[PDB]
Symmetry: D2
Subunit: 489 residues, 4 copies
C-alpha cells in the first residue's frame, strides 16, 4: 500500500476539509495518486500533537532518541529498492541516482544524527569564586520544516535528523509536487517505534499549509529551503511570535577551471555539477568559468559529453538524465534560452525538448550549455534550476574571483587547479558557505551546509545543525559567592 494521507499524532489521516492534490509522474504527466491536502486546520492538529509529545520526547535520554534514528537508517537501507523506485516515480530522478545517491545519503544522514544525539554536550563556564555556572543545550520545542521537491527523500534526513536528535518535535510540510517518499519515511518511523506526535507530515500547498506553519504561534523555529523570494515571506511570517528562522535559498554556483586543471577530471566534474539531478540543485555548478587558455579545448569535450547524455524514462537503469519535476518548471527553463539569445548568448547545445516520441508527454529538456558575453547577463545572474550551464571566460585569478562574486548569491562554489596557494586563497575569497577544490557537490552529514548573504543563514549537518536546533540554558548556583548587600544596612 502506497501511503497518501497526512501523518498526525502517529496515524495516517485525511485532511480536515477532505481536500486532495493530484501527484503527477513527470515522465508522462499521468496521475500517480491523489494525496490528502493539508490546510491550516491540519497544521494546527499537527502542531498540537507535536506540542503534547514534546515533554516526553525531550525528556527521553539522548541515547534513546539516537537509537530510534539508527533503527530508522537501517530500515531505510533494508527498503532501498522500494524507496528508490518511489522517489524516481514521483521526482523523475533516474532510478540509478535514487539507488546510488538519494537513498544512501538519506540513510547516512539519519545514521549520523542517531550517533550524534548523545554527543551534543553543554558547558561549564569559569566565573566568580563560589559560583557554579552550567549551560545546557536544550531543544527549542516544536519545529516546523518546509522542504522543496528537488531532493525530497534526502531532505527528510537533512531536516529531521538534527531536529529530532536534539529533542525537538517536528511538523514537516514536504512539497505537494513530490510528497510520496516522505510519507513512506514517516511510516518507517512509526515501524521502528517513534512515539506518536514526534513527527507529523502535512503535505499541502505552500499558501495553505506552509503559510500556517511559518506563522504558527506554537512553533519555536521554522526551517525553509527554496527560493530567495519565498525566504523573505518566511521571515515576514516569523514576526508573529519571533520564532527562530533557518533559510537555505538560491545559488548560482561558480565552477572555475584554471589553466593547470586536470581537464579529464574537470570536464567530468562540470557535467556532474550541472546535469546531475537535472540541474535541480541549489548547489548546481550553473556558471562554468573557464580560463581562456583551456576554454576552447574544454568546451569541445564538455559539449560532446553533454550532447551524449542519455535522456529517458527514469525507471530505466540506463537513463542518465530524467525529466524535470514539473511542466511549469520545464517552461521556466526553456524561457531562459530566449533570455540568453536576446542578450547575445550562444547556445552550444540543447535548449529544447528531446525528439524521442516516447518522451513527448514528459517534462524533458536536453542538457543546455550557453556561452554568455558578460557576468552581468541575466542567465549569469538568475537561478534557472535546470540542466543549464552558463559559460564565461577569464584570464587572471582576480578576474575569476570577480566573476565568482558577481552575483546576488553565495551558496556553493568550486574550482579546479593544482596550484597549492591558489586553491586555498581562492577558497577563502569566494563568497560562499562551501567551496569544492578538484571536486563538486561533495556533501557529508558532519560537514556544514548552507549559504551567506541572500543565500540564507543557518547550517544543515554536523554540530552546527545541532547548535541551530538547540538553545543555551544557563544556570547559576551561588554556592559560596558571599555577595555583599547592595543596600548596606
Amino acid at each position: 500500500h502506497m501511503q497518501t494521507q497526512l501523518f498526525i499524532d502517529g496515524r495516517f489521516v485525511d485532511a480536515v476539509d477532505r481536500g486532495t492534490i493530484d501527484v503527477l509522474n513527470p515522465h508522462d504527466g499521468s496521475v500517480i495518486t491523489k494525496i490528502a491536502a493539508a490546510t491550516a486546520a491540519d497544521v494546527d492538529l499537527a502542531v498540537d500533537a507535536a506540542t503534547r509529545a514534546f515533554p516526553a520526547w525531550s525528556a527521553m535520554p539522548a541515547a534513546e532518541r539516537g537509537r530510534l534514528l539508527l533503527r530508522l537508517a537501517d530500515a531505510i537501507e533494508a527498503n532501498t529498492e522500494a524507496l528508490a523506485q518511489l522517489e524516481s516515480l514521483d521526482t523523475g530522478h533516474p532510478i540509478r541516482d535514487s539507488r546510488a545517491l538519494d537513498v544512501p545519503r538519506t540513510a547516512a544522514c539519519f545514521r549520523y544524527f542517531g550517533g550524534m544525539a548523545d554527543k551534543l554536550q553543554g558547558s561549564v563556564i569559569p566565573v566568580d569564586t563560589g559560583f557554579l555556572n552550567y549551560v545546557q543545550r536544550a531543544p527549542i520545542g516544536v519545529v516546523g520544516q518546509i522542504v522543496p521537491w528537488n531532493f525530497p527523500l534526502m531532505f527528510t534526513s537533512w531536516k529531521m535528523g538534527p531536529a529530532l536528535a536534539a529533542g525537538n518535535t517536528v511538523v514537516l510540510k514536504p512539497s505537494e509536487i513530490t510528497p510520496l517518499s516522505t510519507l513512506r519515511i514517516v511510516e518507517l518511523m512509526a515501524e521502528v517505534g517513534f512515539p506518536a506526535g514526534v513527527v507529523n507530515i502535512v503535505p499541502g500547498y505552500g499558501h495553505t499549509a506552509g503559510q500556517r506553519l511559518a506563522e504558527h504561534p506554537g512553533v519555536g523555529k521554522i526551517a525553509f529551503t527554496g527560493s530567495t523570494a519565498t525566504g523573505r515571506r518566511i521571515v515576514e511570517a516569523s514576526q508573529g511570535n519571533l520564532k527562530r528562522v533557518q533559510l537555505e535559498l538560491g545559488g548560482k554556483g561558480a565552477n572555475i577551471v584554471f589553466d593547470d586543471a586536470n581537464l579529464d577530471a574537470a570536464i567530468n566534474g562540470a557535467a556532474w555539477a550541472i546535469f546531475h539531478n537535472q540541474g535541480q540543485a541549489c548547489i548546481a555548478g550553473s556558471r562554468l568559468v573557464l580560463h581562456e587558455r583551456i576554454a576552447d579545448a574544454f568546451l569541445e569535450r564538455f559539449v560532446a559529453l553533454a550532447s551524449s547524455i542519455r535522456i529517458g524514462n527514469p525507471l530505466d537503469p540506463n537513463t542518465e538524465m530524467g525529466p524535470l519535476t514539473s511542466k511549469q518548471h520545464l517552461d521556466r527553463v526553456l524561457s531562459y534560452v530566449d533570455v540568453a539569445r536576446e542578450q547575445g548568448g550562444r547556445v552550444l547545445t540543447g535548449g529544447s525538448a528531446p525528439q524521442d516520441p516516447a518522451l513527448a508527454n514528459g517534462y524533458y529538456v536536453r542538457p543546455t550549455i550557453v556561452e554568455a558575453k558578460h557576468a552581468t547577463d541575466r542567465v549569469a545572474q538568475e537561478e534557472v534550476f535546470g540542466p543549464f550551464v552558463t559559460v564565461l571566460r577569464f584570464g587572471s585569478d582576480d578576474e575569476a574571483l570577480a566573476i565568482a562574486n558577481a552575483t546576488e548569491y553565495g551558496l556553493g562554489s568550486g574550482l579546479w587547479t593544482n596550484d597549492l596557494s591558489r586553491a586555498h586563497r581562492m577558497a577563502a575569497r569566494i563568497d560562499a558557505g562551501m567551496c569544492w577544490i578538484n571536486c563538486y557537490k561533495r556533501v557529508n552529514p558532519g560537514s556544514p551546509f548552507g549559504g551567506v548573504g541572500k543565500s540564507g543563514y543557518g547550517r544543515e549537518m554536523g554540530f552546527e545543525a545541532m547548535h541551530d536546533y538547540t538553545e543555551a540554558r544557563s544556570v547559576w548556583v551561588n554556592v559560596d559567592g558571599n555577595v555583599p548587600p547592595h543596600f548596606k544596612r
Copy 2:
C-alpha cells in the same frame, strides 16, 4: 572636551542634514548638550566606511584585533572616574553604581573579548577517504547594532566586544537619550589604534537612523535590544537582504522564594534584583514569587528595606537610587501604579515621586512594591521597566513553576532555596535563557546571555556570541578521492 558628533570613518563629524538632538540630565531635565542626529544618509556613510575597512580588519591576525580590545579595556579603567561621571550625568545611574558596576563590567567584557579573539577555532571534518574538509569561522562582514538607554556604556562592550573580536566591522546606533558615553568609548578606540571605519557610531532616532541600519543592503547582521514591537520591525526590515538577526526583547523575570530560603540573602537579593538601575534592566526581578509560609515575614523586611533606599542626585555618592532615564518612562511607570490600584493590587510602599523639592524637576519615583490579586493581572504580565515589583504567592513547587511560566516572556529567572533537587529541577523547567539560584542578575562575559520565545534569540557573551558573529566556511580539497565519472564513457 565632551564629544557630541557622529563618529564615521575615524573622525567626529556633523550629520549630513546638520540635525541635532538635545540630551537631557534626568536629575533635573536640563539640557546637557546637543548631539549630531544621524539620518539615513549618515548610516549609509557609516556602512560605506565599515565596508571599506572590513577586508583589512578581517585580514588582521586575530591576536592583533585582540590586542586592540585589551588596550581599550585598559584605557577604560584608566578613565574610570571621568567615564563614570559622564555615564551618571546622562543616564541618572548613581555615581556609586557607574563607578562600581558600569565602568568595570564594560572594561571586563572588552578584556574578555580581547583574549577571546584568537581562541575561536575552526574544525576539520572526518569525511570520505582522500578528501580534506576544513571549516573556518569567518566574520559576517559589516554588522549593525542598535542599543537602548539603560546600560549604554556596558552595552558598548556587550555588542562590540564579540563583533570586533570575530573580525566584523561595526555600525552602532546607541540610544539618542543616552549617547554620550558611547562617543567617549569610540574616541578611546581611536586613541588605542582602531583603524578608521572599523567602528562607526551614529546616534539618531529609531525611525531615521535605526530603520535604515536594519534595512541596509550592505549590512550582514542586525543586533537589536529593546521592545518586542520594535523587534518585530527589525525582523521585517531584515527581509530585504536576508541579513542575520539577533534580538533581546522584554523580560518579566520571576524571582521565586521558597520556604526553606535564607531570607536574609533572599531579601537583599530581591532588592538588588529590582531596584538596582532603578529597575531599568531587561533581567530585573520584577515578579517576586513568595511561598505562602514566608511571604508576610519576607515582605515586612523587604518593604522596610525598600522604603529606606536613598533616592537622590546621581552625583551624590550617598545616593542609592537615581531617577528614571526619561520623562516618558517615568509617566509610564506612574501609569502602571494607577493600573495596579485599578485592578485591586495593594501598593505596599512607593508608587509616587519622592517628596524632596530638590528632586521636583527630575524623573524620580520611589521604590514601588505591589501585591497583585492574580498572576494574570496587567502589572504581573507587562514589562514596567522601573523600580516596581509585583508580588504573587504560592504553596506548591508546581504552582511556583506555573506562575513563573505564565507570561509571554522568557529572559531571566531565579529562585532561592536550599533543597538540592528542587534547585536543579526548577531551573530546568522554568522558561528562560538564564536561571539564578540563590543569587540574581549574575552576568559574566563568558556566560551566554539571552532569552527564549518572544524574549528573542541569539546570545551575548562567550563562545556563543562568537558563533553568532561568524559564519561557517566549509572548504573541501580532493586530494586522492578518485571519484569515478558520473557519465561513464
Copy 3:
C-alpha cells in the same frame, strides 16, 4: 562452541609454545576449560598483525569504523543471554547482574563509540596572516590494553570502544582468570566484519604476555587497569619506547551520609555501592562515612539489609551476591577481618564464609561491615576489593572532607545530602575524578571515568577517551605569508 584460543590476525590459534591455563568456576572450583596461554612470542605475532592492519584501518572512513561498532553493539544485545551465562560462569557475577548490568553496559558503550567515530573533529587555528594551520586528531597506531578480572566483559567496551573508533588497532590482554567472555566478544567482532589484525586478544599471565605488551617497541600506547603497584611496573615498562600510558589504579571510595540525607535512599545506595559485584570494583563505596546524628539508626538498618543478602550460586536468578572470583582473593579479604580486629575495629556483620554446605567449594564470603576507630586505620586505608565496608563517623562537614581525603587514593567518591550548597562544595573539594551525589557508581559511556593522584591518569569514556586515543597532527600551509628572508642579501 566455546572459544578458548588466542585470537590473532583474524583467526583463533593456539599459543606458540602450546601452553594452556585452567579457567575455574568460582562457585565450586571446577575447571570450566583450558585456554591457550599467550607468551611474549604470541604478543609479538599480535602486534605484527595489528601493525599490518593499521594503515587500512586508520584510512577507513570514520563512519565505516563506527558502523562496525554499531553492528557489534547490536550483536552483543542479540546474544545477551549466552554472554551473561558465560560471564557469570567465569566471574561468579550473579546471572541477574550479568543480564541487567554487564551485558547492557558493554553494548551501550560499543554503541556510543560507534556513534562517536565520525564525531571527533580536528581544528583550524587562527595564526599569522597568509597562513593556514589545520590540526588533525590522528590515531596513535597499535595500542596495548591490559584488563583485570572484575568486569571483563564491560572492560572490552571501555577499552576497545574509543581505541577502535579513533582508528587505532588493538592488542588486548584480558585476565587469564576470566578470559572467556572476551574471546566471545572478538568472535562477534569477526562475525560483524572487523578486518583481520584490527583486534587481537592474547589471554595469558601478566608476567609473560602482559609484560611483553607493556614493553613492546611497536606499541604506541599502553592502557592498564589494576593495582597501583602494577601501574608502577607499567610506567617502568614504558621507558623503552616512550609509549603513552593510561592508568586506572586503586580506589578507596568514601560514601558520605550527612544527617539530612534520605535514609531510605542512602541505605540502599550504600549496599549497592559496596556489595554489588561482590565489592570487586575500583569505585566501590568501601568507606561508609556516617554523620554522628544518624549513624546508629543507619547502621541498624544497613546491617539488617546486608545480613539478609542472598548469597549463592551465580546461575540462580534468585542469587543477589555470588562468590569472589578467586581463592587467593577470598583469603585476602578474610585476612583483613583480622587486621581490623587487631586495630580495635568491630565486625558488625559477616567476616566469614557462609554456612551453606552447597557453597563449600566456592570462594564465598558474607557481606562484611566493620567499624573502625580512625580514618588512618589499615582497613580505612588499604584496598580490600571485596564485599567489605569500613564505617567511620563524623560531626562537621570539615571532618567529613578530611576523612574523605585521608587516603592515598582518588578515584570515585559520593555523598548523600539535601543541602544544595554542601553538595556542590563537597564535590569540588573531595580528591577524586568522580563524585556521585545522592547516587553511587553511575557510569555512562560519555561521562569521563578515571582518577587523580595515585589512582592514575587518563580517562575512559566520552570525548576525553577519544582525545587520549589520538594525537595532534598540526599542518601549516604558507599561502601568502610573505616571510622576509632571515639572512638579508
Copy 4:
C-alpha cells in the same frame, strides 16, 4: 641588579647548602656570574611553597589569573632591550634574534595564555533521565617543569603560560647553563603581583634538583624537554607517585624540497630552518632532502648563502650567527664533522671554527653543510643540534617519504612544493607532530607543538596545553533518577 639566587616563596634566596654554579658567556668563556645551585632540599622548599599557594591560586577567578599573565606580557615588552641583552649574554643568541624573536615570542605566549585562562570551559554530559552530570577542568596542583638551554626565555612562557593559566602552581628548573633570563622573568612576575609560592625557580644540576623534582611525591605532573635518555629517566622517576608526564625529546627534522618548489623561498627557508639559533632547536631542519632535478642548483645557492652568514659577537647587531651555548656542545658538533667525513660525507662548507682571532675564546663553529652517502649514516640519524645540515637526494615522492620517516624521531617536518595534492598527502604521511608547507618553524601559542613516538608526548600551546594541565572532575547529581533498590525488600 642582575638576580642570581633561587626564587622560592616570593623571595630570592641562597641554596640551603650554599652551593653555586658558574654561568659562562659563550662568546669568550668568561664568567658572567655565579648563581645559587639548588639541590634536593631546595626543591623541597619550592614544592612546599607551591603546595601552600595552590588552594588560593586555584580558587582565584580564572580571569584574575589571566590578568596577571596579561600584565606579565606587557612588562616583558616594556623590558625588551634589557631582557634581550641578558638573554644574548647568557645564551649566545645574536642580539638581533633576542630582540626580534626571543622576547616577542615570550610576550606573545604569556599574552595568549593570559587571555586563555577564563576561556577553558567544562562540559555537561547527556546522561540518564533525572541526573545532572557536569565535568570541570580542574588544575592538577603543583607542577614541575624542567627546561633546557636553547630558548630559555621563550620556554618560560611555553611552560608557565598554560600551567599558571589553568590554576596550577609551578616549580621550574631552568638550565643551569643559561638561567639568568628566567630569574628576571620571575622577578617581573613578583612585580606584577603573582602571589608568593605560585612560581618557584630552582636552577641547579639535573642530577640534583632535576631528579628530585621528577621524583617528588608532592608534584602532580612533570614536564621535560631534553634528550631521549633523560626522558626515560623522567619516566622512571614518575613511578613513585604516578605523576603525569609530558616529554619533548628532540627531532631530526626533514625539510623536503620538491622539483616544483619556489627555490628562492626554499633556499631562504632552509637557511632559517637550520642556521637560526645556531641550529640549537629541536625542530631544526637538520635533514635537507632535495629532489635530484634541483639538488645541485639548490646547493650552489644554499652553500653560497651559508658561507656568507656573518658569525660573531652576539652583542653586535650586525651579527647573524653567534656561538654555540657551551664548550661541551661545540666539541660534540666538531666530533660529528669528523664522523661525517669518516663515513664518506662531503663537507660542502664549514665544519670548523671561524678563523677570526677575536672569536678564539668562544664556542664558535661555521655553518656546516654535509652531503651524506646514505640516509642511514650517523649524521643523517643522530641529533647534532648545531648549525649543521645533512643533505640527502630523492627521485619519487615515495622515496622522499621513506627518507623523511627513516629516523627514530618524529617532532617537526616540512616540505616545499606547489602541487596541491602532494602538499596535503605528504603532510598526512610524514611521522611528525608538525608539518610546515612552504615555510618552516612556524610557532604560534595557539598551535599545538610536540612529537610522536620517541620524540615524546603531550603538547605545548593552545587548548591542547590547557587540557594537559587540567584533569576532568565529573560530578553527578541525582535530581529525579528514581533508582530502584538493588536488593529488593
